[PDB]
Design an enzyme around this catalytic site. Sequence first.
Site, PDB file in Angstrom:
ATOM      1  N   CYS A  23      -4.247  10.680   5.434  1.00  0.00           N
ATOM      2  CA  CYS A  23      -4.209   9.266   5.837  1.00  0.00           C
ATOM      3  C   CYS A  23      -2.853   8.867   6.437  1.00  0.00           C
ATOM      4  O   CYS A  23      -2.828   8.090   7.392  1.00  0.00           O
ATOM      5  CB  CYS A  23      -4.627   8.342   4.700  1.00  0.00           C
ATOM      6  SG  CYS A  23      -4.009   8.846   3.083  1.00  0.00           S
ATOM      7  N   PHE A  24      -1.741   9.405   5.913  1.00  0.00           N
ATOM      8  CA  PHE A  24      -0.422   9.234   6.534  1.00  0.00           C
ATOM      9  C   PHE A  24       0.181  10.593   6.936  1.00  0.00           C
ATOM     10  O   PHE A  24       1.389  10.677   7.155  1.00  0.00           O
ATOM     11  CB  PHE A  24       0.556   8.486   5.610  1.00  0.00           C
ATOM     12  CG  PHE A  24       0.136   7.073   5.292  1.00  0.00           C
ATOM     13  CD1 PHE A  24       0.109   6.104   6.277  1.00  0.00           C
ATOM     14  CD2 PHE A  24      -0.140   6.692   3.992  1.00  0.00           C
ATOM     15  CE1 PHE A  24      -0.284   4.806   5.984  1.00  0.00           C
ATOM     16  CE2 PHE A  24      -0.514   5.387   3.699  1.00  0.00           C
ATOM     17  CZ  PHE A  24      -0.578   4.451   4.697  1.00  0.00           C
ATOM     18  N   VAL A  27       2.463  14.371   3.512  1.00  0.00           N
ATOM     19  CA  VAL A  27       3.573  13.683   2.854  1.00  0.00           C
ATOM     20  C   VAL A  27       3.835  14.277   1.456  1.00  0.00           C
ATOM     21  O   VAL A  27       2.886  14.547   0.714  1.00  0.00           O
ATOM     22  CB  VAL A  27       3.289  12.157   2.761  1.00  0.00           C
ATOM     23  CG1 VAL A  27       4.528  11.388   2.304  1.00  0.00           C
ATOM     24  CG2 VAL A  27       2.790  11.600   4.096  1.00  0.00           C
ATOM     25  N   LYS A  49       7.848  13.396   5.330  1.00  0.00           N
ATOM     26  CA  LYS A  49       6.769  13.802   6.214  1.00  0.00           C
ATOM     27  C   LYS A  49       7.218  15.080   6.912  1.00  0.00           C
ATOM     28  O   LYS A  49       8.365  15.176   7.361  1.00  0.00           O
ATOM     29  CB  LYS A  49       6.440  12.715   7.238  1.00  0.00           C
ATOM     30  CG  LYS A  49       5.240  13.063   8.110  1.00  0.00           C
ATOM     31  CD  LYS A  49       4.800  11.899   8.981  1.00  0.00           C
ATOM     32  CE  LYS A  49       3.542  12.226   9.750  1.00  0.00           C
ATOM     33  NZ  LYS A  49       3.049  11.073  10.555  1.00  0.00           N
ATOM     34  N   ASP A 146      -3.790  -1.770  13.394  1.00  0.00           N
ATOM     35  CA  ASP A 146      -4.612  -1.395  12.239  1.00  0.00           C
ATOM     36  C   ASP A 146      -4.097  -2.066  10.970  1.00  0.00           C
ATOM     37  O   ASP A 146      -3.994  -1.420   9.923  1.00  0.00           O
ATOM     38  CB  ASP A 146      -4.601   0.139  12.091  1.00  0.00           C
ATOM     39  CG  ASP A 146      -5.704   0.701  11.218  1.00  0.00           C
ATOM     40  OD1 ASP A 146      -6.614  -0.068  10.839  1.00  0.00           O
ATOM     41  OD2 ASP A 146      -5.638   1.906  10.883  1.00  0.00           O
ATOM     42  N   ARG A 150      -4.986  -1.395   3.091  1.00  0.00           N
ATOM     43  CA  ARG A 150      -4.805   0.058   2.984  1.00  0.00           C
ATOM     44  C   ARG A 150      -3.509   0.526   3.671  1.00  0.00           C
ATOM     45  O   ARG A 150      -2.978   1.581   3.314  1.00  0.00           O
ATOM     46  CB  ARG A 150      -6.012   0.819   3.587  1.00  0.00           C
ATOM     47  CG  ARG A 150      -6.238   0.578   5.077  1.00  0.00           C
ATOM     48  CD  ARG A 150      -7.421   1.346   5.653  1.00  0.00           C
ATOM     49  NE  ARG A 150      -7.649   0.937   7.039  1.00  0.00           N
ATOM     50  CZ  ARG A 150      -8.391  -0.102   7.423  1.00  0.00           C
ATOM     51  NH1 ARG A 150      -9.056  -0.824   6.525  1.00  0.00           N
ATOM     52  NH2 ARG A 150      -8.485  -0.421   8.706  1.00  0.00           N
ATOM     53  N   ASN A 151      -3.012  -0.239   4.663  1.00  0.00           N
ATOM     54  CA  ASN A 151      -1.800   0.108   5.399  1.00  0.00           C
ATOM     55  C   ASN A 151      -0.566  -0.676   4.965  1.00  0.00           C
ATOM     56  O   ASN A 151       0.427  -0.700   5.685  1.00  0.00           O
ATOM     57  CB  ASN A 151      -2.037  -0.005   6.910  1.00  0.00           C
ATOM     58  CG  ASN A 151      -2.806   1.185   7.450  1.00  0.00           C
ATOM     59  OD1 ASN A 151      -2.692   2.304   6.928  1.00  0.00           O
ATOM     60  ND2 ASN A 151      -3.597   0.985   8.494  1.00  0.00           N
ATOM     61  N   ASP A 164       2.135   2.741   8.732  1.00  0.00           N
ATOM     62  CA  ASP A 164       1.224   3.093   9.830  1.00  0.00           C
ATOM     63  C   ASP A 164       1.557   2.368  11.141  1.00  0.00           C
ATOM     64  O   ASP A 164       0.684   2.224  11.997  1.00  0.00           O
ATOM     65  CB  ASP A 164      -0.245   2.814   9.440  1.00  0.00           C
ATOM     66  CG  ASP A 164      -1.263   3.765  10.044  1.00  0.00           C
ATOM     67  OD1 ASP A 164      -0.996   4.987  10.065  1.00  0.00           O
ATOM     68  OD2 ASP A 164      -2.352   3.295  10.440  1.00  0.00           O
TER      69      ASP A 164
HETATM   70  C1  LIG Z   1      -2.749   7.763   2.525  1.00  0.00           C
HETATM   71  C2  LIG Z   1      -2.933   7.597   1.260  1.00  0.00           C
HETATM   72  C3  LIG Z   1      -2.424   8.527   0.232  1.00  0.00           C
HETATM   73  O1  LIG Z   1      -2.455   9.746   0.390  1.00  0.00           O
HETATM   74  N1  LIG Z   1      -1.624   7.967  -0.687  1.00  0.00           N
HETATM   75  C4  LIG Z   1      -0.316   8.521  -1.047  1.00  0.00           C
HETATM   76  C5  LIG Z   1       0.602   7.300  -1.129  1.00  0.00           C
HETATM   77  N2  LIG Z   1       1.831   7.321  -0.344  1.00  0.00           N
HETATM   78  N3  LIG Z   1       1.785   7.433   1.030  1.00  0.00           N
HETATM   79  C6  LIG Z   1       3.041   7.103   1.513  1.00  0.00           C
HETATM   80  C7  LIG Z   1       3.479   7.105   2.690  1.00  0.00           C
HETATM   81  C8  LIG Z   1       3.934   7.109   3.904  1.00  0.00           C
HETATM   82  C9  LIG Z   1       4.324   7.077   5.282  1.00  0.00           C
HETATM   83  C10 LIG Z   1       3.981   5.939   6.001  1.00  0.00           C
HETATM   84  C11 LIG Z   1       4.414   5.811   7.314  1.00  0.00           C
HETATM   85  N4  LIG Z   1       4.203   4.801   8.249  1.00  0.00           N
HETATM   86  C12 LIG Z   1       4.815   5.202   9.339  1.00  0.00           C
HETATM   87  N5  LIG Z   1       5.381   6.434   9.204  1.00  0.00           N
HETATM   88  C13 LIG Z   1       6.128   7.121  10.216  1.00  0.00           C
HETATM   89  C14 LIG Z   1       5.836   6.795  11.652  1.00  0.00           C
HETATM   90  C15 LIG Z   1       5.378   8.092  11.081  1.00  0.00           C
HETATM   91  C16 LIG Z   1       5.147   6.842   7.898  1.00  0.00           C
HETATM   92  C17 LIG Z   1       5.477   7.988   7.195  1.00  0.00           C
HETATM   93  C18 LIG Z   1       5.001   8.130   5.902  1.00  0.00           C
HETATM   94 CL1  LIG Z   1       5.505   9.514   4.976  1.00  0.00          CL
HETATM   95  C19 LIG Z   1       3.838   6.856   0.408  1.00  0.00           C
HETATM   96  C20 LIG Z   1       5.268   6.506   0.424  1.00  0.00           C
HETATM   97  N6  LIG Z   1       5.866   6.354   1.604  1.00  0.00           N
HETATM   98  O2  LIG Z   1       5.860   6.393  -0.651  1.00  0.00           O
HETATM   99  C21 LIG Z   1       3.062   6.927  -0.731  1.00  0.00           C
HETATM  100  N7  LIG Z   1       3.446   6.702  -2.045  1.00  0.00           N
HETATM  101  C22 LIG Z   1       2.580   6.841  -3.195  1.00  0.00           C
HETATM  102  C23 LIG Z   1      -0.273   6.094  -0.737  1.00  0.00           C
HETATM  103  C24 LIG Z   1      -1.705   6.522  -1.028  1.00  0.00           C
HETATM  104  C25 LIG Z   1      -2.110   6.243  -2.453  1.00  0.00           C
HETATM  105  O3  LIG Z   1      -2.410   4.862  -2.534  1.00  0.00           O
HETATM  106  C26 LIG Z   1      -3.164   4.548  -3.688  1.00  0.00           C
END
Ligand SMILES: *CCC(=O)N1C[C@@H](n2nc(C#Cc3cc4ncn(C5CC5)c4cc3Cl)c(C(N)=O)c2NC)C[C@@H]1COC
Length: 280
Positions: A23-24, A27, A49, A146, A150-151, A164
Amino acid sequence: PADPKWELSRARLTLGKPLGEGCFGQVVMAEAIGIDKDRAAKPVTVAVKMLKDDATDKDLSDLVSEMEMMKMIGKHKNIINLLGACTQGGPLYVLVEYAAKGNLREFLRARRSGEEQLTFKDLVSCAYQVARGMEYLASQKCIHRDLAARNVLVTEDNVMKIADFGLANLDYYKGRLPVKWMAPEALFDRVYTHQSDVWSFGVLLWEIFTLGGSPYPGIPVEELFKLLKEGHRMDKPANCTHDLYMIMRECWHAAPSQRPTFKQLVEDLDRVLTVTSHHH
Ligand SMILES: *CCC(=O)N1C[C@@H](n2nc(C#Cc3cc4ncn(C5CC5)c4cc3Cl)c(C(N)=O)c2NC)C[C@@H]1COC
Ligand SMILES: [Cl-]
């Protein structure tokens, strides 16, 4: 290409456990020491990432462009910020802020009951913070395309962080299109603006005040566009105030030019916070 102001020593990074799937991107969570070079060995938990093992040259350029886009957009308390990168002497690692409480949709659905049950004022605060992050992104000419609960990611200190962003022929067939968050003109033309983001923010407000409800319950996708064009809109969530529902309804104005700006939404939600502290 070298960029010392953003470079972190690999020796100061300890990679940890993966964070879910698909989804992201790929990571993992990690402990990083000395992100702020004036704070000596201050430890900080971060999200990293990186590329998949079978990644192509285009995947590398994509992640490099996403990193450069984060450098250009700049910092704001209510977006997932870039903390730095390991670009020299090994695989590419892009470090961003860690959000322990996951995405906003799951944060809300887990706090409908129990000691950590969110109050109405907590929900207004969440909406206000997302509006502040979007006000910032719009000021940097960034369209999210988007926006949805969720984002949005939530930190240990309950800080909302828009995620996102940065990343962003459709007429030929080869995450489905988020039709229930899209403004009618975005559904119709498949073109996005800051005004279509404001419509999406209205749907996100409905998600917040239903504590993670699914938009347009019971509406088949083939009926959605016609209903929205005829003036159909979601009903007021239970426990939601008339003022907050009016903000949602203004976000969903048929005319994009008549929707509020994110600057105005910040002001409106700041007003609602004030009025909320009086009716309790
Ligand atoms: C997608 C849902 C999922 O697997 N989890 C894990 C949890 N999670 N995801 C992130 C993140 C991130 C992130 C977001 C971005 N937006 C832009 N960009 C860059 C331009 C490319 C990024 C890069 C990344 Cl790495 C995190 C976090 N950052 O801590 C976490 N923490 C838990 C969310 C979701 C579970 O939700 C219940
Ligand atoms: Cl705006």
